[PDB]
Chains A and B, each alone.
Chain A
Amino acid sequence: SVYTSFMKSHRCYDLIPTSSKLVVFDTSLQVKKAFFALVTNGVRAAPLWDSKKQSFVGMLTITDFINILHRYYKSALVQIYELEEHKIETWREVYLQDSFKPLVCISPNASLFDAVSSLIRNKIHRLPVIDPESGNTLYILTHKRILKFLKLFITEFPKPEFMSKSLEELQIGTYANIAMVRTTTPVYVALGIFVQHRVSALPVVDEKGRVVDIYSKFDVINLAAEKTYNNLDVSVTKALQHRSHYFEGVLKCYLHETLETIINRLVEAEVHRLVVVDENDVVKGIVSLSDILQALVLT
């Protein structure tokens, strides 16, 4: 395809910005301090470095912050002891006692077809770009970065017929096994849904099932920013009040809209997913960037 062959041609180095910032955590660091560092530097994920092994072991993301909170949260009347007293290495040991996960990374000279494949195969949203010579981590590659690169640097024509095909006819996205929360749903319950379903975002719906908001994994890090993480009994609506002053309505799409329209909307909005809705905003499903990139690579 026009996009498939494009990703085969270009190298990961092409997506690396001119000047960027990269945060790296020592695995002996207090895990609470690490999540505060992600907020301070404006970074959603960091490579983990073991001084003992002299190697990058893995990645610390907001998902790990969600896992810790849901696991060790007891009530708002008692502190979360493990979150404060654990080290990144100590919780990694608790998280995978028998299961073993390696560090998924990629060379800057590898193609985009390789990068998109790695993100899909490993079910990861964070792919570190590591130079094999120096051993330094150059950049953290994401779905959002790749698709925006495709949109900017690919000409519309030639245009495949599949771009004008509707979302419904292409069968892109998840219209089954939905993971949502009510407006009144406590944050702790939302964290549990994140852990079980392992989805990037939860559409916030009213009594009628119409989506009035969205609670993503990124929004959870605001608990660390405000240091409100010790009260999870609050509703997801109260947790999302911080962005109220400058927020546009939840980004959505319809089954009759074309794939190109949806890709343009996501690249312009710089968000990871759209909520598939009917005319009353009732949620019919979700179209994410992982759904789109899997369609562009396979075809």
Chain B
Amino acid sequence: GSVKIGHYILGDTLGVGTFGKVKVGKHELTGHKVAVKILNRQKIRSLDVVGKIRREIQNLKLFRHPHIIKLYQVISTPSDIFMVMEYVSGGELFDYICKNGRLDEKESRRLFQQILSGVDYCHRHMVVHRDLKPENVLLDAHMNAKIADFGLSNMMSDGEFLRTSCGSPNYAAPEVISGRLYAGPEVDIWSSGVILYALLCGTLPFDDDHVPTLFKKICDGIFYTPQYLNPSVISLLKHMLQVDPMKRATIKDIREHEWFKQDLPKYLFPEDPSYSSTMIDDEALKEVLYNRNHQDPLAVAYHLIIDNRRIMNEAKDFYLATSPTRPHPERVPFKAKWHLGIRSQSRPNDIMAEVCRAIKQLDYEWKVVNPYYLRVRRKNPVTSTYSKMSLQLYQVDSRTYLLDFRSIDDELTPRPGSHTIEFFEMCANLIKILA
């Protein structure tokens, strides 16, 4: 007898994983090849990712996109979980660059457009890969990029930041190696910049055998630009590799960049850069894979009305506000400066003590997760329900610190009052004391 799961005959080991090995497989009838990621259930219990594994399976299985590895099926056994995925024969992009050296400009751009399309698709679905690098970018027989190994990925939540140490130092953003909080799309963009550099130069932009030197090189953002590099893509690299995450290029910026726009196929970015819906986008949906796959009429109709809405340019100002001729009639006759939470120049220990005694003064219940992190709950004296908020002390500068208020969604059914206003009133009581 052989080793056979889901009619596939398990072959040689492609690669190893922290939880389990990845093994090629071959259909006993058609000879179709897949990649089977074996997850030992007792191992995923030892370090408890069981919820994280459950989530990764959900998201990856819903994903469809040419340049992301597809998850065909997840087969469960008493001792093991089998993830059946598409198989690409070209292997790692890293190995291809090792063997063949640097790719020319047109081939580097062709692959980078495919890779960034996958990265964009992940961000639209609120997923950050966090592991992006040539080792995790595979190739098929036709040299199409395939993004793999979402094991280190994460699902982004509203109002939350990610401090988790991830990936590799060479591909890690300056804020990642510094342990600073980040949103995470800007980190995938940094990694994509290093991939783009590796495609063009055949070497890594930040590398050193001395680890402290390497971490300084990354935080300095200084890398060598070879003479043969197009100044256009150099400007693109400088923007993606910006140390400041607020000055770092977005995917919208890259799509607008002239070097990226050249030769770009339409299937890679069928959608507007915005990750939020527009009136025009919904219009097509109301009229009732195709966007990312080769064109089909049902897919074609979508672009048809999108291009028809664009040519006129008369419908865009309706659904959203542009930031910078005829003034809007209601904007003509009508400055307050907003700020985040409340600031204190006192000691971090003193301001946390003042908060805690004020939480107690208001008869609020609170749990201490971190010295600077608090989770506070207030019972509404009217509706007899509970209002939750999280408190985090941040450091603005040397002498300045900031208390951050953040609302927490409840799990309740339709409920009395306003969840947003109840959050404001709860903060209002505390702010009144602290001010």
**A and B, direct touch (CB closer than 8 Å):** yes
A280 proximal to B (CB < 8 A)? no
Q: Report whether A14 and B333 are in contact in the complex, using a CB–CB cutoff of 8 Å.
A: no
Checking A44, A55, A134, A246 against B330 with a beta-carbon cut-off of 8 angstroms, the contacting residue is: A44
How far is B413's CA from A44's CA once the two chains are assembled, in angstroms? 32
Return A104 CB to nearest CB of chain B, in Å: 17
How far is B421's CA from A24's CA once the two chains are assembled, in angstroms? 9
A159 proximal to B (CB < 8 A)? no
Q: Report whether B318 and A148 are in contact in the complex, using a CB–CB cutoff of 8 Å.
A: yes
Q: Report whether A270 and B282 are in contact in the complex, using a CB–CB cutoff of 8 Å.
A: no
CB nearest to A222 among chain B residues: B333
How far is B336's CA from A52's CA once the two chains are assembled, in angstroms? 29
Q: How many residues of B contact A (CB 8 A)?
A: 35
Return A193 CB to nearest CB of chain B, in Å: 21
How far is B278's CA from A18's CA once the two chains are assembled, in angstroms? 7
Q: Report whether B413 and A246 are in contact in the complex, using a CB–CB cutoff of 8 Å.
A: no
A170 proximal to B (CB < 8 A)? no
B residues within 8 A CB of A243?
A: 332-333
B residues within 8 A CB of A42?
A: 330-331, 334
B73 proximal to A (CB < 8 A)? no
Checking B318, B329, B419 against A17 with a beta-carbon cut-off of 8 angstroms, the contacting residue is: B318
Checking A39, A148, A149, A271 against B329 with a beta-carbon cut-off of 8 angstroms, the contacting residue is: A271
6 residue pairs, one from A and one from B, having the closest CB atoms: A54-B382, A54-B417, A222-B333, A135-B418, A18-B320, A134-B419
A residues within 8 A CB of B318?
A: 17, 148-149, 152
Return B335 CB to nearest CB of chain A, in Å: 9
Can you sample 24 A-B contacts with CB below 8 Å? A17-B319, A18-B277, A19-B276, A19-B320, A39-B334, A40-B336, A54-B382, A54-B417, A133-B413, A133-B414, A134-B418, A135-B416, A135-B417, A136-B419, A136-B421, A218-B329, A218-B330, A225-B333, A225-B334, A243-B333, A246-B326, A269-B329, A270-B328, A271-B329
Return B92 CB to nearest CB of chain A, in Å: 40
- Mark out the residues of chain B between 333 and 357 whose CB falls within 8 Å of any chain A CB in the assembled complex: 333-334, 336
How far is B420's CA from A54's CA once the two chains are assembled, in angstroms? 12
- Mark out the residues of chain B between 394 and 433 whose CB falls within 8 Å of any chain A CB in the assembled complex: 413-422, 425
A residues within 8 A CB of B277?
A: 18
Query: Between A and B, how many residue pairs show CB distances below 8 Å?
Result: 80
CB nearest to B417 among chain A residues: A54
B383 proximal to A (CB < 8 A)? yes
CB nearest to B282 among chain A residues: A14
A residues within 8 A CB of B413?
A: 133
Q: Report whether B417 and A40 are in contact in the complex, using a CB–CB cutoff of 8 Å.
A: no
CB nearest to A40 among chain B residues: B336
- Mark out the residues of chain A between 52 and 80 whose CB falls within 8 Å of any chain B CB in the assembled complex: 52-56
Return A209 CB to nearest CB of chain B, in Å: 25
A51 proximal to B (CB < 8 A)? yes
A residues within 8 A CB of B327?
A: 246
A49 proximal to B (CB < 8 A)? yes
B47 proximal to A (CB < 8 A)? no
A residues within 8 A CB of B276?
A: 18-19
Q: Report whether B279 and A49 are in contact in the complex, using a CB–CB cutoff of 8 Å.
A: no
Q: Report whether B283 and A135 are in contact in the complex, using a CB–CB cutoff of 8 Å.
A: no
Return B319 CB to nearest CB of chain A, in Å: 5
CB nearest to A225 among chain B residues: B333
Q: Report whether A49 and B334 are in contact in the complex, using a CB–CB cutoff of 8 Å.
A: no
Q: Which residue, of B283, B421, B422, has the highest number of chain A Cβ atoms within 10 A?
A: B421
A242 proximal to B (CB < 8 A)? yes
Query: What 1/0 flags go to B299-341 for Cβ under 8 Å of A?
Result: 0000000000000000100111100001111111110100000
Query: What 1/0 flags go to A198-236 for Cβ under 8 Å of B?
Result: 000000000000000000001101100100000000000
- Mark out the residues of chain B between 355 and 382 whose CB falls within 8 Å of any chain A CB in the assembled complex: 380, 382
B residues within 8 A CB of A18?
A: 276-278, 319-320
How far is B415's CA from A243's CA once the two chains are assembled, in angstroms? 46
A residues within 8 A CB of B422?
A: 54
Checking B326, B334, B382, B414 against A40 with a beta-carbon cut-off of 8 angstroms, the contacting residue is: B334
Q: Report whether A153 and B331 are in contact in the complex, using a CB–CB cutoff of 8 Å.
A: no
Q: Report whether B333 and A221 are in contact in the complex, using a CB–CB cutoff of 8 Å.
A: yes
CB nearest to B412 among chain A residues: A133
A residues within 8 A CB of B320?
A: 17-19
Q: Report whether A19 and B321 are in contact in the complex, using a CB–CB cutoff of 8 Å.
A: yes
Query: What 1/0 flags go to A1-39 for Cβ under 8 Å of B?
Result: 000000000000010011100001000000000000001
Q: Report whether A152 and B315 are in contact in the complex, using a CB–CB cutoff of 8 Å.
A: yes
Q: Report whether B419 and A153 are in contact in the complex, using a CB–CB cutoff of 8 Å.
A: no
Given contacts A135-B414, A246-B332, 17 further A-B pairs with CB under 8 A are: A18-B277, A18-B278, A19-B321, A54-B382, A54-B416, A54-B417, A133-B414, A134-B420, A135-B418, A135-B419, A136-B418, A136-B419, A152-B279, A222-B333, A225-B333, A225-B334, A246-B327
Q: Report whether A132 and B417 are in contact in the complex, using a CB–CB cutoff of 8 Å.
A: no
Known: A17-B320, A19-B321. A49 touches B332 (CB 8 A): no
